[PDB]
Amino acid sequence: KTTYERTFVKKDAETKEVLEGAGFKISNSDGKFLKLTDKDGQSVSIGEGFIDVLANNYRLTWVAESDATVFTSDKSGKFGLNGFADNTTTYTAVETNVPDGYDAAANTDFKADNSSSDILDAPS
Amino acid sequence: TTYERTFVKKDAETKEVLEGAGFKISNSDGKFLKLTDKDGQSVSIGEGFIDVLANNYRLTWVAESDATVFTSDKSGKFGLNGFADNTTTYTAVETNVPDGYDAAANTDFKADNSSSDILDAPS
Amino acid sequence: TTYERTFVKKDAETKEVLEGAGFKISNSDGKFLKLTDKDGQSVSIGEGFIDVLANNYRLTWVAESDATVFTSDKSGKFGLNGFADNTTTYTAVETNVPDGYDAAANTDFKADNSSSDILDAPS
Amino acid sequence: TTYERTFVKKDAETKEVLEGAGFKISNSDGKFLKLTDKDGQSVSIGEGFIDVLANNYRLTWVAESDATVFTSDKSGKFGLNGFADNTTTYTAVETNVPDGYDAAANTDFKADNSSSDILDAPS
Ligand SMILES: [Zn+2]
Ligand SMILES: [Zn+2]
Ligand SMILES: [Zn+2]
Ligand SMILES: [Zn+2]
Ligand SMILES: [Zn+2]
Ligand SMILES: [Zn+2]
Ligand SMILES: [Zn+2]
Ligand SMILES: [Zn+2]
Ligand SMILES: [Zn+2]
């Protein structure tokens, strides 16, 4: 069936330069967090950047925070994924891994609406 | 002499079986079920019914974070044999929810060799 | 110069030794015992008494979630040598309870080279 | 352009260097230092000074439970290079205490390329 995607671009709040290596978990209103598995329900190692769930035949599951997948901004500051089942549900991108020299961005509320948007990390 | 329990995960609307829904099992002491091998080591289990007896596994009760996750297979089924006790209440808690679904309500049960459905509502 | 402690896990009713009961050891600072190798790395231990001295392990005190689990063997036995101090109170806390049993009460002890029983009640 | 910091763990009585004492590093936001590789993955570090620059690691600030533990080596040494900032106060918190010792007090520091002692009292 049809799915939805979301992209984010991590940036320095002052210079607007893209920031690599900022790690995020995605939560729903049930207090569960997004975990990617392969087709056999096994954990997968993902790198930085946008994760092509569709091309890799991954599955989205919602799990306890500690078992969640960390998504990490790449060289272009980008991260996210496709393959979301629902575009009307509010999720929150929570910065769990903050690059040194920066403060965590505020939580970013979003829907899987196929858009791209910026997340700013303040220096210091 | 032991007891078993099976569950079948289904879509609450269509009743189609649902694969990949993960569950932990708790007791009234607030501990959760962990399978080990005969030497007390963790084992990797897949989806479906776990034949504890055939594999010589052991059932232990541990902290939630160390617990075994049981996952519905292609036929929506999961569970296990090897329970010592058929009169004790346990709860199946959905900890890993398939995307596009809401978590089912907690399912109270006894290890009575029965099989029963657990429904996940579409989101 | 070091000290050791052994425990024997048993069924409280039958007194039969019980294998697969897992324990963490805490101190009064609320930290828990972790064994490492000579390079500070985690080690996988099995059931039974752990010969820390022979394996050149080290004892460290860490957060509960990073602690080593000691597990009763076929003879119901577990524990270790290599304790630096015999006058300090520690507590053996049952974290992994064999199915069909209740957790034993916490067991206060000192590393005094003694052996003592820990009883798990059925149910 | 980056900064480094070294610490030497010692017995407060004998001043002999102490191996196997584990530390986390926190900032004023209550987050703790985690080293990752270039692809944001966790890395296994051993004891001693961590050459972040040579290994192309990254410093990130995370929840205490996800933090990297730095551990004193044979020479009692630990620390790292690669800090972005030399004017910000951090704290070295002993999380893994060698048996036979008390935890050192928290050690406030800046990444100023210096080396300094941290003392663990016996008992
Ligand atoms: Zn919901
Ligand atoms: Zn209930
Ligand atoms: Zn719903
Ligand atoms: Zn017997
Ligand atoms: Zn044995
Ligand atoms: Zn990597
Ligand atoms: Zn103390
Ligand atoms: Zn201070
Ligand atoms: Zn010195």
Side-chain angles (χ1 to χ4, degrees), chain A residues 2-124, chain B, chain C, chain D:
Chain A
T2 179
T3 61
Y4 308 96
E5 70 179 60
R6 194 64 164 78
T7 301
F8 301 95
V9 187
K10 193 67 169 74
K11 299 183 176 175
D12 178 307
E14 285 270 11
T15 66
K16 304 290 193 192
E17 67 178 12
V18 300
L19 312 162
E20 181 181 12
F24 289 79
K25 289 176 184 180
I26 293 166
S27 69
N28 63 16
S29 58
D30 291 33
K32 295 202 204 303
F33 291 78
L34 187 59
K35 184 189 177 157
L36 301 186
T37 65
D38 70 24
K39 78 186 112 188
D40 307 310
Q42 304 299 291
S43 294
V44 288
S45 311
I46 64 154
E48 302 184 329
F50 186 91
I51 305 302
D52 193 339
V53 164
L54 294 180
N56 291 122
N57 205 16
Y58 296 152
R59 291 202 298 250
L60 280 66
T61 64
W62 296 93
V63 307
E65 189 176 357
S66 64
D67 297 326
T69 294
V70 178
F71 300 86
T72 309
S73 62
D74 68 8
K75 286 320 198 182
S76 299
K78 89 190 333 181
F79 67 99
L81 67 151
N82 57 27
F84 284 99
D86 186 12
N87 66 332
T88 59
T89 301
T90 305
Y91 307 115
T92 297
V94 182
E95 193 171 358
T96 51
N97 305 45
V98 184
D100 179 51
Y102 288 90
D103 262 296
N107 286 351
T108 303
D109 295 347
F110 72 97
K111 294 182 178 172
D113 53 21
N114 305 330
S115 74
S116 181
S117 58
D118 292 349
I119 299 175
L120 308 177
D121 284 211
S124 92
Chain B
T1 271
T2 58
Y3 307 96
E4 70 179 59
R5 196 64 165 77
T6 301
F7 302 93
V8 186
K9 192 67 170 75
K10 299 183 176 175
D11 177 307
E13 181 80 8
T14 66
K15 305 290 194 192
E16 273 181 16
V17 299
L18 188 44
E19 182 181 10
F23 289 77
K24 288 175 184 180
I25 293 166
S26 69
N27 63 16
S28 57
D29 293 278
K31 295 203 203 303
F32 291 77
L33 187 59
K34 184 188 182 50
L35 301 186
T36 65
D37 69 26
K38 77 181 155 44
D39 306 310
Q41 304 299 289
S42 292
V43 289
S44 310
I45 67 153
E47 303 185 330
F49 186 91
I50 304 303
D51 194 338
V52 163
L53 293 180
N55 288 285
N56 203 16
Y57 296 153
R58 305 289 196 279
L59 280 66
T60 66
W61 297 97
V62 307
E64 189 177 356
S65 66
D66 298 326
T68 294
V69 178
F70 299 86
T71 309
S72 62
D73 67 9
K74 285 320 198 181
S75 85
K77 88 187 189 172
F78 67 99
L80 67 150
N81 58 26
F83 284 99
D85 186 12
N86 67 332
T87 59
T88 301
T89 304
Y90 307 115
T91 300
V93 182
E94 193 172 356
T95 51
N96 305 43
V97 184
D99 182 50
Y101 288 90
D102 262 295
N106 287 351
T107 303
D108 293 350
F109 72 97
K110 294 182 178 172
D112 53 21
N113 303 332
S114 73
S115 180
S116 57
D117 294 349
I118 299 175
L119 308 177
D120 286 218
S123 276
Chain C
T1 179
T2 60
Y3 309 95
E4 71 180 59
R5 195 64 164 79
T6 302
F7 302 89
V8 186
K9 194 67 169 71
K10 298 183 176 175
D11 180 306
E13 179 81 8
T14 66
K15 305 290 190 240
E16 164 173 15
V17 299
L18 188 44
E19 180 181 11
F23 290 79
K24 289 177 184 180
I25 293 166
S26 70
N27 63 17
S28 58
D29 295 279
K31 295 203 203 303
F32 291 78
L33 186 58
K34 184 188 183 50
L35 301 186
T36 65
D37 69 26
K38 288 280 106 190
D39 307 310
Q41 304 299 290
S42 293
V43 289
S44 309
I45 64 155
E47 302 183 330
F49 186 93
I50 304 302
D51 193 338
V52 162
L53 295 180
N55 288 286
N56 297 334
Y57 296 153
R58 291 201 298 250
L59 280 66
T60 65
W61 296 94
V62 307
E64 189 177 356
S65 65
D66 298 326
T68 294
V69 178
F70 299 85
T71 309
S72 63
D73 69 8
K74 268 64 188 181
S75 299
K77 279 194 188 172
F78 68 99
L80 66 151
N81 58 25
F83 284 100
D85 186 12
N86 78 51
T87 58
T88 301
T89 304
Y90 307 115
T91 298
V93 182
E94 192 171 359
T95 50
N96 305 43
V97 184
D99 183 50
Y101 288 92
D102 261 297
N106 287 351
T107 303
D108 26 346
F109 71 97
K110 293 182 178 172
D112 53 20
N113 304 331
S114 73
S115 181
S116 56
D117 293 348
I118 299 176
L119 307 178
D120 287 216
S123 115
Chain D
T1 179
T2 60
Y3 308 95
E4 71 180 59
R5 195 64 164 78
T6 302
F7 302 88
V8 187
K9 194 66 170 75
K10 299 183 176 176
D11 178 307
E13 153 162 18
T14 66
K15 304 290 194 192
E16 67 178 14
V17 300
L18 188 44
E19 181 181 13
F23 289 79
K24 290 176 184 180
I25 293 166
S26 69
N27 63 17
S28 58
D29 295 278
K31 294 203 204 303
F32 291 78
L33 187 58
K34 184 188 183 50
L35 300 186
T36 65
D37 68 25
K38 283 182 112 188
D39 307 310
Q41 304 299 290
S42 292
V43 288
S44 310
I45 64 154
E47 302 184 329
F49 185 93
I50 304 303
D51 193 338
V52 162
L53 294 180
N55 291 124
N56 228 315
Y57 296 153
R58 291 202 297 250
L59 280 65
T60 65
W61 296 94
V62 307
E64 189 176 356
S65 65
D66 297 326
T68 293
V69 178
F70 300 87
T71 309
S72 62
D73 68 9
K74 285 321 198 182
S75 300
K77 278 194 187 173
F78 67 99
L80 67 151
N81 58 25
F83 284 99
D85 187 12
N86 67 332
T87 59
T88 219
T89 189
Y90 307 113
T91 298
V93 182
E94 193 172 358
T95 51
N96 305 42
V97 183
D99 178 53
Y101 288 90
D102 261 296
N106 287 352
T107 302
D108 294 347
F109 72 97
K110 293 182 178 172
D112 53 20
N113 305 330
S114 73
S115 181
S116 56
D117 293 349
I118 299 175
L119 308 177
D120 286 217
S123 305

